Design a protein that fits this description.
The chain is of the alpha/beta class and 355 residues long. It has 13 helices and 13 strands. Helix 10 links the parallel strand 12 and strand 13. The structure holds ligand A1AA2, flavin mononucleotide and orotic acid. Flavin mononucleotide binds next to strand 4, strand 6 and strand 11. It is classed as oxidoreductase/oxidoreductase inhibitor. Keywords: dihydroorotate dehydrogenase, dhodh, oxidoreductase, inhibitor, OXIDOREDUCTASE-OXIDOREDUCTASE INHIBITOR complex.
Length: 355
């Protein structure tokens, strides 16, 4: 462990989190990242993964929700992420829920949020990506892809049409798109929706045609997961992001704010996510790439998700407590563990628990 990792985790982040409300802290983080104001890990070949029609120089991505409006993409690559996912972006601008809407549970290394899809909207984000479109084309070619998580407006009558709007507007600027699914006449509704998203995707010109992934929560029933796996295979959905935050409250949470409404992220989600990855990988016969997310704050965490079936991983909440150096830390620890377990690279470890 580096000097920076320890200073940030032991001193700087606790101090900053004690001086700032959580929403301000997140806002500040976006502004510092967008300005490239970052502590200074060369990515080995062993971290490279090929999936989703793309080289990923390393398999550690930034999860959706950090950079909701696509303001900090370049700084997120500078921070050392192998890929960046922006959003969720809704079609029209919207404010999201009233404040306060994000909460730290430092004793649990957890966050609860109820942002409510606060979004600048498609049009603002489209112009923002357009301004750096060619810079991104070089980044993607260099193994640093961009994802866009697409949302729906609060008062949308037609969810499918909102996502279709997102495909049309941001699909041409993305390497991959993500649509968040909640509980599924439910399987048929999901089919109808994903059909429409794929049809819209397929209507884009070849060079501007993104992969489509479905992101799930960890709170689905067995039946919901079976149905999602079935639909995903039937329709040729390109991948799964496993998982979003949980509405559960695992026994053992200590933070005072544990009973705040919202999604819980960070360490208490970790194993629930991993086991979701495991089930989705088995239900799709290892044929659907999975991006694994939820409580990754170490190499071990990352490797457990990979071995359970993830091709790639994302983290977000760990940044709250470790700051930017966590990115280098996870990569360094993952590489070391890959070597200790006999894997030539990340690719060999994907789904290794199932074999
Ligand atoms: C719960 C509130 N949430 C959102 C969930 O995570 C939050 O607090 N998040 C959160 C904060 C961060 O830092 C707050 C303290 C800052 F910005 F005020 F220092 C950073 C972070 O990486 N900061 C950072 C940076 F961008 C560039 C250079 C140095 C630093 Cl230290 C990331 C985060 F995800
Ligand atoms: C403050 C906050 C905002 C989030 N916003 C989004 C979002 O807009 N769309 C989305 O798909 N996921 C969102 N997430 C979920 C993350 O993408 C991720 O799935 C979840 O936090 C689990 O990963 P983590 O434990 O590493 O944070 C958000 C998470 C947090 C903590
Ligand atoms: O904006 C939010 O509230 C949000 C969206 C999402 O997909 N996940 C989450 O935890 N929060």
């Amino acid at each position: 462990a580096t000097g920076d990792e320890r200073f940030y985790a032991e001193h700087l982040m606790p101090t900053l989190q004690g001086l700032l409300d959580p929403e301000s802290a997140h806002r500040l983080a976006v502004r510092f990242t967008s300005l490239g104001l970052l502590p200074r890990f060369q990515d080995s070949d062993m971290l490279e993964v090929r999936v989703l029609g793309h080289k990923f120089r390393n398999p550690v991505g930034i999860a959706a929700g950090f950079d909701k409006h696509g303001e900090a993409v370049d700084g997120l690559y500078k921070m050392g992420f192998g890929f960046v996912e922006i959003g969720s972006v809704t079609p029209k601008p919207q404010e999201g829920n009233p404040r306060p809407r994000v909460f730290r549970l430092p004793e649990d290394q957890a966050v609860i949020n109820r942002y409510g899809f606060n979004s600048h909207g498609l049009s603002v984000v489209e112009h923002r990506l357009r301004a750096r479109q060619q810079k991104q084309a070089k980044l993607t070619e260099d193994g640093l892809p961009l994802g866009v998580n697409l949302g729906k407006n609060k008062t949308s009558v037609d969810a499918a049409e909102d996502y279709a709007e997102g495909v049309r507007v941001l699909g041409p600027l993305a390497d991959y798109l993500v649509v968040n699914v909640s509980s599924p006449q439910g399987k048929a509704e999901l089919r109808r929706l994903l059909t429409k998203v794929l049809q819209e995707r397929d209507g884009l010109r070849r060079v501007h045609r993104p992969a489509v992934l479905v992101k799930i929560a960890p709170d689905l029933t067995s039946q919901d997961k079976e149905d999602i796996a079935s639909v995903v295979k039937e329709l040729g959905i390109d991948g799964l992001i496993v998982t979003n935050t949980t509405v559960s409250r695992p026994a053992g949470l200590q933070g005072a704010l544990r009973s705040e409404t919202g999604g819980l992220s960070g360490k208490p989600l970790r194993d629930l996510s991993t086991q979701t990855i495991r089930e989705m990988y088995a239900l799709t016969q290892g044929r659907v790439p999975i991006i694994g997310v939820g409580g990754v704050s170490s190499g071990q965490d990352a490797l457990e998700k990979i071995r359970a079936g993830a091709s790639l991983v994302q983290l977000y909440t760990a940044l709250t407590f470790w700051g930017p150096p966590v990115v280098g830390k996870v990569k360094r620890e993952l590489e070391a563990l890959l070597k200790e377990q006999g894997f030539g690279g990340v690719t060999d470890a994907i789904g290794a628990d199932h074999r």
